[PDB]
Symmetry: C2
Subunit: 417 residues, 2 copies
């Protein structure tokens, strides 16, 4: 089919998904989760083909994101079941209910955004995440993956369509031919390099784009930091996965620690991990807005929490920023005043992830201050609609000399759990 | 002060507002509401000056929006008290609470967007609305009004600052000198013409812009429409305020009504109201995407509800669209399938307004499908932050061969009312 026909099928499949009972959407997602487990061997075989075709040729950033492990598949399956189990009140949820006037009733409800386009390079593991999240939110979906992940994406899409078939909604998730280049789509979600993400931002006039182009993440080691905690926190944030959007890029160190064994153990762990430190200005006594995405790290000296906060605001990407301290007051101050999507106390920067956060999965991480901030789960794939049911109501009747009065009585709404 | 200094004061005043107790923000808003009433005579005197300076000179669209009536001031005061009374759990509200793992706790909370810039032409009545909504959501605010409303805006700003002074947060609401032309601002909210709204959309690289550039609104008269209801609904939607963004632009008529007294009474009321009808194609047997903003109206014939829905989707601005019918099934079908921000049954198009909807006020009406849809109240002025409090937690510990397991236990959260 043509990409325009895929758009139309995703839209009609999306609309059918939204009219299913919540339990039926959950059923599709449970089935997909089972298929990830049951079909692991074939999944891994197709991923092996991708890896072998990529070996020696695909750029290291893309290559690292290409592999699918038995472990990863196991967490996907766990995450998809969490979505299935938690998503039942999601679509058509009543947000507001107001009696505007006698016989004039308003409600505000959640509805799907419509049709999503996810454009991802490498990352076959995001296919099941975004498909399950779209399914759970009643959305249609077009998937545009790269050549490098063709075998993996192909099988993962097949399985998704097998899961959808149980309620006759295969059309809801379309795989776009790698042939195609970058009114139909309501939202674009790019998953890849800053260049791809900014290229997409540029070519998308009209359509909103959801994500982040950068991950300049900080960790502030406070004067009251536990010597028993700092090293492993810095090591994990920087070294567990240097290429990650939430990898540590700038280590901010309280001044009271420069002549301390705590500071020594840090430099010791950084040299054991073969990490290139670049000294910030104060510290010495290139750029503080750099994402290394490798075994490199900025270390700068600060005077106090306020200084750390100021630095994070000035140089950071508002993605993930962390304080290490034993002082609760100081920690809570930092958590309150750092304006990042994700602010942590005594936990690694690497925790910002939909699955880790108990969302089951993410479509991506957003650093926007509009719509959806941080890892975006199913709720960031919904918008709203205002419904007004009247008798014969006109605004003139409510004017100064009119016959009618407003009541504006908010009515009770079902609690969530 | 310079506009950069105003930015900094709004930001610091915003941050102080957010750290106040909810009851103190409510107190500021209650005081402002009282001042609108107590100072009505001076407000009206300043507005009279604006009107007299505008008389014969200001463009009719801007002029119509320039007047402040004793009535309008009364509804502002009522709307501001509704905000004060309903806004107490708004800022810092817990959205999600999850025990990620033993001693690793996550919460997602609401926080202010930061600093808002509202750019409005004419409309002095929006000043108190946007100021009260910003105050209630913990935001800083810069107001950029036009020369035509200088006296009104001046007094309304003065009073706002008097209200803020009770908790020492005058700086939170800045009035930008009409001198200035179109890192500091987190959101722009334009209130004016499609040209201004699109000029702003264009000049704002970086900053999100919230609103609508168009109001092509439809009303579908179903075959099962009550003859006793249609005429007054069409008359109000079109004639009560033709220049309104939510004024009726296209009347869609079910075919089963062409040879009916119901149809006759419509044309009769349209001629009494001296309204220029332009026949759609089918009907006859210029453009269907036109906003007249005057006593002009498109009438097109349709075959059924599906046809009406298709037409609304094709030609409409997804703002406000209405069905007139006595058949509940048909009405609910329309309400479900029309993708507009606001869909009504047997109520005038003119009801889409923050005050009318029980929001107390609006910052504007949004036709976006991201962030905030329809009239935007205080809740569209909030974003979120993820807080993670750990012990010494690292992601490696949770890996396949690690020591730690996730719990992902959602914890109970306080209900709202």
């Amino acid at each position: 089919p043509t990409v325009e026909q895929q758009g139309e099928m995703a839209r009609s499949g999306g609309r059918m998904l939204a009219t299913l009972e919540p339990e039926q959407r959950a059923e599709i997602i449970h089935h997909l989760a089972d298929l990830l487990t049951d079909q692991r061997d074939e999944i891994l075989l197709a991923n092996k083909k991708d890896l072998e075709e990529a070996e020696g040729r695909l750029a290291a950033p893309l290559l690292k994101r290409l592999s699918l492990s038995t472990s990863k598949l196991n967490s996907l399956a766990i995450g998809l079941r969490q979505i299935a189990a938690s998503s039942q009140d999601s679509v058509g949820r009543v947000l507001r209910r107001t009696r505007i006037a006698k016989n004039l009733e308003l409600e505000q409800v959640t509805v799907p955004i419509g049709v999503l386009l996810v454009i991802f390079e490498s990352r076959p593991d995001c296919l099941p995440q975004v498909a399950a999240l779209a399914i759970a939110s009643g959305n249609g979906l077009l998937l545009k993956g790269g050549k490098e992940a063709a075998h993996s994406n192909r099988i993962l899409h097949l399985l998704t369509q097998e899961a959808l078939s149980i309620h006759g909604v295969k059309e809801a998730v379309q795989l776009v031919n790698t042939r195609e280049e970058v009114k139909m789509i309501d939202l674009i979600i790019p998953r890849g390099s800053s260049q791809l993400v900014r290229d997409i931002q540029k070519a998308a006039k009209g359509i909103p784009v959801m994500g982040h182009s950068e991950g300049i993440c900080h960790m502030y080691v406070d004067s009251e930091a536990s010597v028993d905690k700092v090293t492993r926190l810095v090591r994990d944030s920087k070294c567990e996965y240097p290429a990650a959007c939430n990898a540590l890029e700038t280590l901010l160190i309280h001044r009271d620690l420069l002549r301390t064994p705590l500071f020594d153990q840090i430099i010791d762990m950084l040299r054991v991990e073969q990490v290139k430190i670049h000294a910030g200005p104060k510290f010495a006594s290139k750029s503080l807005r750099t994402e290394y995405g490798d075994l490199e790290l900025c270390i700068e000296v600060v005077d106090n929490v306020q200084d750390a906060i100021d630095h994070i605001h000035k140089y950071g990407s508002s993605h993930t920023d962390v304080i290490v301290t034993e002082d609760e007051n100081t920690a809570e101050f930092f958590l309150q005043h750092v304006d990042s999507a994700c602010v942590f106390w005594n936990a690694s920067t690497r925790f910002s992830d939909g699955y880790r956060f108990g969302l089951g999965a993410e479509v991506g991480i957003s650093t926007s201050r509009i719509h959806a901030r941080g890892p975006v789960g199913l709720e960031g794939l919904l918008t709203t609609k205002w419904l007004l049911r009247g008798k014969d109501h006109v605004v003139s009747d409510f004017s100064e000399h009119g016959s009618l009065k407003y009541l504006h009585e908010n009515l009770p709404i079902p609690q969530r759990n």
